[PDB]
Amino acid sequence: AFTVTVPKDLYVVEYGSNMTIECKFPVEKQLDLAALIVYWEMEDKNIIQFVHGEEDLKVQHSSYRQRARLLKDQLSLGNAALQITDVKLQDAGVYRCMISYGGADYKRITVKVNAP
Amino acid sequence: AFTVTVPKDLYVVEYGSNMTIECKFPVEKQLDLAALIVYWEMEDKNIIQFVHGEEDLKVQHSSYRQRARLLKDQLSLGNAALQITDVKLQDAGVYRCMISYGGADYKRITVKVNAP
Numbered sequence A, B: 001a002f003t004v005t006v007p008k009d010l011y012v013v014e015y016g017s018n019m020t021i022e023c024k025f026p027v028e029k030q031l032d033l034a035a036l037i038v039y040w041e042m043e044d045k046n047i048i049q050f051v052h053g054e055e056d057l058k059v060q061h062s063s064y065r066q067r068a069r070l071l072k073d074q075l076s077l078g079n080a081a082l083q084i085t086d087v088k089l090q091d092a093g094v095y096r097c098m099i100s101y102g103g104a105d106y107k108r109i110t111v112k113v114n115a116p
């Protein structure tokens, strides 16, 4: 019965505005590193690769480096919160996340940028 | 480091010819159901959803029903072997898998159909 919910399927943020997107998963009070694996993607681009407490920076995509970080503290709560600072038009698209803690599931999130 | 290899990144099969595609993963002598979760996809279409020894048939896509089955015996060997019988042009495309047994990973496989 391990399913993983998103709050909202569509985020609509302006250019330059900092964004953060969420993926709520079940946690049994406390959290285990050896169990937890998290991943983020947008059109086959490595955004986050988090394996039991190991973000490798080389593996991340070149056009995401000083901007796309996952909030570490948020995972204690039971939420993979991916942050982007200084949003671009280029970042607009469909964002996959994948999570494995006990069970496993994934979800897609549409992201559409604006520009005044 | 739990990584999951494909033998070949491109399968080239004729129309009507039966196809089978592979995803080799590590197994530590014996295999555990409660651990293993497997999934198959092609352009956001549910092909297989296998959760600790549970294929649900309703969840599978409508245009895949009497054709796309995963070989159960093959998983003992350490290989998710997805079979399609009676291949169509419609089935040609990019096939995602993905697997969680101990660790987790995913891989894409290009599939290009022929007809002489």
Ligand SMILES: N#Cc1cncc(COc2cc(OCc3cccc(-c4ccccc4F)c3Cl)ccc2CNCCO)c1
Residues within 6 Å of the ligand: A037, A038, A039, A046, A049, A051, A098, A099, A100, A104, A105, A106, B002, B003, B004, B037, B038, B039, B098, B099, B100, B104, B105, B106, B107, B108
């Ligand atoms: N360039 C490039 C490129 C090409 N291929 C793959 C990658 C990313 O490779 C990873 C992804 C990853 O997360 C996937 C994940 C997380 C949580 C649950 C599931 C998960 C599993 C099964 C069912 C449901 C699920 F939700 C999955 Cl599949 C973890 C580790 C790796 C390591 N990759 C290197 C070895 O192959 C990058």
